[model samples]
Target: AECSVDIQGNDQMQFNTNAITVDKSCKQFTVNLSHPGNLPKNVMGHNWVLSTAADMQGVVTDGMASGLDKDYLKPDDSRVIAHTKLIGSGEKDSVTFDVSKLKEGEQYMFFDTFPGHSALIKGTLTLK
Candidate 1:
């Protein structure tokens, strides 16, 4: 249970936290994304995408190109370490990824790829 994070996004274009820490000993880590906003998905869609800090920019660009039709992310993006399905108000989604892929001291990121949303809703993921 400690390996899971319950995170949320809002109409304000924000995710509740700016940092997430995962223990290396965990078999896997879970990220649960939720929308606590009033707007529908077309207006305030959200998802939690995880990748190395270095992969962020490129991933975000391609995500926009893919649009909501593909949950704002490329289907076969190897850069994405993990991600939850895009959801809207009153909806929730979750993803679990192998903890062995993480390396200590390496930086990771979790963010949303909604078209109008920027990386400001992003957070650092530390494996310790």
Candidate 2:
């Protein structure tokens, strides 16, 4: 049976694990997010957004302009393949996306696009 996994984020803009694996046969993949620090979302909120590494900087920059109501993502942003709602200091969010959306040879980058968190809160996702 396919199951979910844990990902840890903190106030310092870091994810405990710098990488994550997604089982290609799962039919659907879900990312469960948690921020272990005690900071407020405004100061250190985090969310997981996935796209190609080529789209990372543009997504993050445009997202920062979008602000929290839009979860720091541009409205109707097509670059985001999957994403969890923003989480802050013990808060949690989950996002499930169809496995068919990913290609075997493709690489996905997951990032926390909060104003300035991308410096460390990002990772390359693997589909296998």
Candidate 3:
């Protein structure tokens, strides 16, 4: 089986689930994000962004300036480990990153980078 997961975001500005696990034996992992609500991208957009837990704030802070046109992310920000494209109602996107990039003791987080979406749509990513 592939080392992957499906995540959903909705009009409620929330993720359907929290926490994702990457098996130690896998060389890579994939996160598939889907927006299932009827809202438009400008109103309820979502994107799956990944980075070290410590870098979350800085990334989010900078992203605010990038705005919706740039998919709510800084252009080519190195701190971003992986991410999906901004999506809206019934749209989907996916991103895959090497599992080796994650350290045994380091913490990682995944979230929606769409403006205010970060406050409510975020989750922890763990390596098992």
Candidate 4:
């Protein structure tokens, strides 16, 4: 077991934390997302999406069809390792995953699926 990490998204299209590491001893990890902005989800919503650095573009492209209703993600997308639901101001979401699901030498990308928000709201995660 491992402790969870907390993060925040604001109206500025940004995440308060940009990078994270998983401890070797931990079997599971959690990412918590909070929106402190003042806009509606349809206007400036945010969500934490995770996938391999290499698969991000394709996932984002395909997720377009899923739309906000599907959390901006394709239905049962295998490329996605974990993700949170779309959220608006004062709303929150979270995702937890098994550490064994992540590869040792791979870099994972975490991002927001709100149309163009990924440009500014993204981060990296790795295992130690």
Candidate 5:
């Protein structure tokens, strides 16, 4: 259904894609995250987090204190629409979320909450 995308993290510490376009036919969407590099969870780990484009800033900042235990996510943060768990090298995680929360043409934002990686590792997400 073209409802999912692969967004694995690289050894260089960056997302494989900069943007995501959700197909209109999709009732739900998924992002499969994996790491190609063989690193530990305490090392080159990462996860995907989705929120409104504007909510990106605050959520990133607030998540820093959440730590690796919580996947660096603030527990039940309303700003978050969907997310995957923190995974290390050779590990993978996928997030499936209903498209009902998405509005056409509205720009959503996603980024890795792996401490200090927010600055350069983020992009826009849109439902089209």
Candidate 6:
């Protein structure tokens, strides 16, 4: 199986890539993430959140309503395939999910849920 990988986010609310892929043969897939920015979680925090692209807007709005204690994610959202914990400057988190949950030709999106960061901090996952 191919190895899992990491993508980085920074103070500017940017991700290293717009796309990612999980190897279909792997039983589990992982996304290692970090916030290299110097801002605190309330300002420029980061998280790698996964959900179907069509669900992105709803999830983001719901997540914002849920607040930070829930890591900006709607509690136990069925739409979420996986998500990393929110992190501040220099902190890191990882999210792992069953590879079988992914479907080919479908788009899975990942984004940072810290307030305004959703505008730019995002990526997509594909299974191959």
Candidate 4 residues 8-81, lDDT tens each? Answer: 99998899888988886788889899999999898898988889999888778877767888777888789989
TM-score of 1: 0.95
Question: In candidate 2, what residue range of length 10 has the lowest lDDT sum?
Answer: 1-10
Off-target runs (Cα >4 Å) in candidate 3 are none
Error of 3 at 5 (Å): 0.6
**In model 5, where do residues sit more than 4 Å from their true spots?**
none
**Scored by Cα lDDT, where does model 5 land?**
0.88
Quantify how close model 5 is to the true structure by its C-alpha RMSD in Å. 1.1
Candidate 1 per-residue C-alpha lDDT over 1-128 given as tens digits, one digit per residue, 9 for 90 to 100? 38998998988899989999998789999988889889999888988888999998888889999988899997799999988988999999989989998999988988888886755789899998
Please list all clashing residue pairs in model 5, or write none if there are none: none
Per-residue lDDT of model 2, residues 1-128, tens digit only: 46466787887788877787887778888888998999988888999899988888999999999998888999888889989988889799888888888888887899999988898889898888
* Least accurate 10 contiguous residues by lDDT in model 1: 111-120
For each of the candidates, the C-alpha root-mean-square deviation to the true structure, in angstroms, is 1.2, 1.3, 1.1, 1.4, 1.1, 1.3
lDDT by residue (1-128, candidate 3, tens digit) is 45999998999999977788888888999888898999989889998888999999988888878998999899989999889998999899988889888877789998888888889998898888
Query: Per-residue lDDT tens digits of candidate 5, residues 1-128?
Result: 59999988876888988899998889999999998888887777788999999898878888888887787888879999999988988899999999998999777999988888877789989888
- With a 3 Å backbone cut-off (N, CA, C), the pairs that clash in candidate 1 are none
Q: Cα lDDT of model 3 overall? A: 0.88
Please provide TM-scores, in order, for all candidate models, with all chains considered together.
0.95, 0.93, 0.95, 0.93, 0.95, 0.92
Give residue 48's error in model 3 in angstroms: 0.8
After the best TM-score superposition of candidate 2, give how far the Cα of residue 86 lies from its true spot, in angstroms: 1.0
In each prediction, how many residue pairs overlap at the backbone (N, C-alpha, C within less than 3 A)? 0, 0, 0, 0, 0, 0
In candidate 5, what residue range of length 10 has the lowest lDDT sum? Answer: 38-47
Alpha-carbon lDDT, every model = 0.88, 0.87, 0.88, 0.86, 0.88, 0.83
List ranges where model 1 is wrong by over 4 Å. none
* Model 6 weakest lDDT span, ten residues long: 109-118
